[model samples]
Target: NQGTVNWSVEDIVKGINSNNLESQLQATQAARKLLSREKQPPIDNIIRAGLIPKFVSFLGKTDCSPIQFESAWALTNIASGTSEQTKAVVDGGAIPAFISLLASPHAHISEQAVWALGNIAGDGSAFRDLVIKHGAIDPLLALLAVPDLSTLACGYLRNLTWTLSNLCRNKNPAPPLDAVEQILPTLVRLLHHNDPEVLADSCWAISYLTDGPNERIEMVVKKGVVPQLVKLLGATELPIVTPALRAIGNIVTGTDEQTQKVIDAGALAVFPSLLTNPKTNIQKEATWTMSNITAGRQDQIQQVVNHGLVPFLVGVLSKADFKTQKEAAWAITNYTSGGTVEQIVYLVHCGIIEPLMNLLSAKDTKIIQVILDAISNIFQAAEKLGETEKLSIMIEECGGLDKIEALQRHENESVYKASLNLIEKYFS
Candidate 1:
């Protein structure tokens, strides 16, 4: 009989439904074993057999820890299925049951439950929202306090934080403001964690929260996340560095005080290096962050220029690809918008006009406008400094006047007008 034993999906379902506790445990284990194969189980058959609800029921049981562990293990694998399959777990009302086990004295049970929730959350925003809506945040945060939980029983804290990160992922709306606000302080603390997995997910969660509306962004800045974010930028791990840069990029978009908070934290010292990072995306992000920083007040703008960013930015404007060039141009525009006369002159003296003027023939209309605006700022500053004639000569020497004259016939009215104004005031 033992040699002939066969575990079909239906038989597993029957055993899960049986009154025998041993049978229930075996059925749950069998379901997990079937689901665990590299090739997926017949999820539809198992789901239709009502095994999902049975697994959820076992998760709620207080008297039997083995049953609870096996049930959570089974549900975790089930949630790892396709979205439709994961939805089956969600629709079975497994969220609350899973969340409840985070409080279990049994670490593996808690770990399995966290794993299930992470998979469910990873499915997409809708399922992620469901997990949060079912009161998952509080218990998820509580898991962080269980020391060595991250190290023991196969890294529960890593999964726990990853679940939190997923819940905070997706910027189309971002996680609920109040929910993120509640756990943000703890997340910032996790940034310093020794575990790369924990640190990376923690940075991602902060990035998500920071990407929300202004009120939410200010809430994060108010919690003093800027300094912590700056520290993480030095992380050698791309996972950590990328999101840390992303969070800094988002933080700079906050109010002047918030942007200045990052600058005052000595963020400028790292910009030159990050801008030249071999990774193109990090280069773009660094440029974007600098752009926002330059958009701040004169002192903040001065802080960027003071850090020797102008020459590097000018190099990117000329040699980098379109996206990096665009952000580099944006930073220069902000600099000219709020910069002091000395700063503007410094930009010109650094030979910015040659590269900017060279970009006039760039096919992108937006780039043309940015280039003209920067020129206008330079001329305006020159007028103040009584150096208009000197700058006019510089532009002519750079062949900028000829380029602007040609652009006078540009089809875009704004471009044409900007070209005409630059010629009439400075060139003509």
Candidate 2:
């Protein structure tokens, strides 16, 4: 008697088949509770009750039916439950059925289908290709053009765009630029929205598209996205501020002209202001944008360091959580190493060793590579000061010369030789 009738499994099955819609919903809920009780359930039973057949039955029924509503709700519950459950649904051929419901005249069914599909598409392993192939973009864009989307609609759109962005991001080594270009303007408009999730997804899409190649950056610029992004960054809200900064950072990563456009747009000023936000998420984002923007620009890096951004970043690195710490450490490394020795020593004296070392051992290889590159630059900076002890301490504390050397030994001999030449600059 946990909260309702105590029915045996056979009794509940009989109830489900008894044709009382209200009782069916109650029975379904009861079954879900029972199934959830065990830490693990029989896989076949879970699938048999969980897959496409049950949901498709509801899709075929009229939207106003209690059974239809219950089934739709149950389908959403299953889709959002776990990766395995979502995978089973997609594999069971629910995409076409769900997409059909999304096109339904009934608003409730259409809304539920959109929400369910958004969650289902998130897994990427199953629903991604299906979602794109079904011409999902036009319908999703129509949702955006609505003067005001319901909360459910907005939430679904956010999930859909994020999943779509990830799908495009990991597509062939070369994703289709045209696909991203088609959606770019709607994404930019979303940056100014009140919902933080919407803003974040929009920014994420922009980041995904611009990260590919120079031509992608040109495509975004050609669409006039930079000024709009900068305008969003100027807003005081974190939802707007964080994503706008990130979008700008992503666009500028591989292109010189885009970087100049960012600086020209006064993004640099608005971006640094976020360093003072009490929210660590905002701070982490601002740090990441700083690192990306300052990557190859020494003058801009000095301006950032001089604006008192370095100490703020060091403070975050010293005491923030893992995510913020990593962002701060990497940001400082990028900002300083890519600049003069003055910045490097400033970072070193500010107690960067422990955290930087922790990040050096991170499981993410990209993070590890960045840490190593920054270490090499810092050691070179120390060598320039005739401080052998400093260099030796760094080398000793960070494994050994061999570990660092091995990281630098690249097939690109020119890059290796250039690194050596840069290191030798400090010795002379």
Candidate 3:
């Protein structure tokens, strides 16, 4: 019965804040357990304030064995929490300690270090730049090359690569194409790893690599990456099939030869069916692939649209769930935005205008922004058809241009504002 002593949430919270070292250890360990899981626990706030301070204090202690080890493990969770916590832990100068923990004698502590570095590195801003500046990648890569005592050694390497890939890219003051080229072979080598997480991260890296200068994309395509990446899509044990597929999409978008390679790899058949698949994440990636693949290629765009993608997107919009509708609407907008006026007519005849209007009402700023862009796309196309009044009718039915002004605060503000501004400049 003593072991079964009742513990309220308040009691546990108080116990965690207690001065007793053992009590503090118990509380921190419990918090660590929750943070390690996929779905974060509800005690996130309490753990954030109490557990992190305790762990930070533990890091300051010179005791070599369990204290540092436990602190390292807890730090991984703190770094991996919500964005604010991630910034806080990094701002607190936890990087040097985290880097040191990566070499901990305890296997689990080192594993936690890898993950903590990954969590911190995932953000592309100051933290990741700092990690790279501190020379984290080479050590992380070395650990990846030689498997350590930690079972998740490969997994950690995968996360590290993802962090670097995501962070290393910049539009202004861009890292040179040569910097991207240097990492290309390393990323390709990682694709050979049996681990799906590794393969997925490598695929993500490949995608980011191709995002740079045109020459970089062409150079990677020349190295025969398409077949290897396509093979990854069929990997049943893989956790990141969609990303692998997406990497293929990125490669094929530019080079005709690359596009042929993707078709040769049998991607066309699998891509469309993934649209209606239950996993929205996968569907979203697939939609992105389709969007990229169709860019600057009208015939290919028609090929994809012919595969029933437009209708499926329209159907998803009619669903009760907001996320599904939002994504589907965005997908449609992306697909049809650059398309010919005939394509816009197809959307109009399908009664998609109403759903587009409905999406404009969504509270999600991104969704509203996307919906407004779609409206501009439709209106722009309709203007070409001398149907500005018809476009106005649809706009009126969807709460008019006022909603556009409201949603313009998001990323797509320029597109919406431009549309409104242009209409005022030209039409009315």
| Winner by lDDT | 1
How far off is residue 266 in model 1, in Å? 1.0
TM-score versus the correct structure, for each prediction: 0.88, 0.65, 0.55
In each prediction, how many residue pairs overlap at the backbone (N, C-alpha, C within less than 3 A)? 0, 0, 0
Q: Give the TM-score of candidate 1.
A: 0.88
lDDT of 3 by residue, 32-151 (tens): 555555665544564545556657666655454566666667677667667887877776677877776666666666666677777787655566667766666665655556543235
Ranking by lDDT: 1, 3, 2
lDDT of candidate 1 at residue 82, scale 0 to 100: 88
Q: Clashing residue pairs, candidate 3?
A: none
Lowest-lDDT window of 10 residues in candidate 2? 419-428
Candidate 1 lDDT, 235-258, residue by residue in tens: 788888998999989888988977
Off by over 4 Å in 3: 1-63, 147-183, 219-223, 236-239, 255-428
Across 1-428, the per-residue lDDT of candidate 2 in tens digits comes to 46434445555465566677667656554554544444653334545643346545655666335455545655666666678887776676666767766666666666667766777766653465566676666676665676654454665666555655554454344345555666777766665667767766666667666666778788877777788788877776666666667677777776667777777777766655677677777777777777776675777777676666666776666566667667776786676567788878877776665556555444555555566567667777877887756665665565544344443565455445543553454322
Better of 1 and 2 by TM-score: 1
Mind sharing the TM-score for model 2? Answer: 0.65
* Residue 369 miss distance in model 3 (angstroms): 20
Better of 1 and 2 by lDDT: 1
